[PDB]
Amino acid sequence: MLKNLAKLDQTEMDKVNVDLAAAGVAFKERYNMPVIAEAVEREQPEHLRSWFRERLIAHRLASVNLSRLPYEPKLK
């Protein structure tokens, strides 16, 4: 009548990709992780935030380490 397999769970396909990129460290300690990555996942992986909440990441973006958009003087 109005149904079909696959309700909605493809977003992971894009996450399963970046999943190899970062593990949720460089992104943002999140919980103030030490100079380790195996602890970032063992504790609380950032990605998991979207990899798990993918259902509706919402907000998005963070910037904790990278840090962009300085305070240039502009205008010579």
- CATH for 58: 1.20.58.250
| Ranges assigned E (strand) in 1-69 | none
Owning domain of residue 60: 1-76
CB 73: neighbour CB atoms within 10 A?
Answer: 6
SS3 assignment, position 19: helix
- Phi, psi (rounded to 5 degrees) for 70: -75, -165
Burial 10-31 (b: 16+ CB within 10 A, else e): eeeeebeeeeeeebbbebbbbe
Residue 53 is given by DSSP the state H
User: Is the alpha carbon torsion for 10, 14, 15, 19 positive or negative?
Assistant: positive
Residue 57 tokens read as 């990441």
In contact, 18 and 47? CB cutoff 8 Å: yes
Domain total of the chain: 1
CA atoms within 13 A on the CB side of 30: 18
Residue 16 tokens read as 């399963």
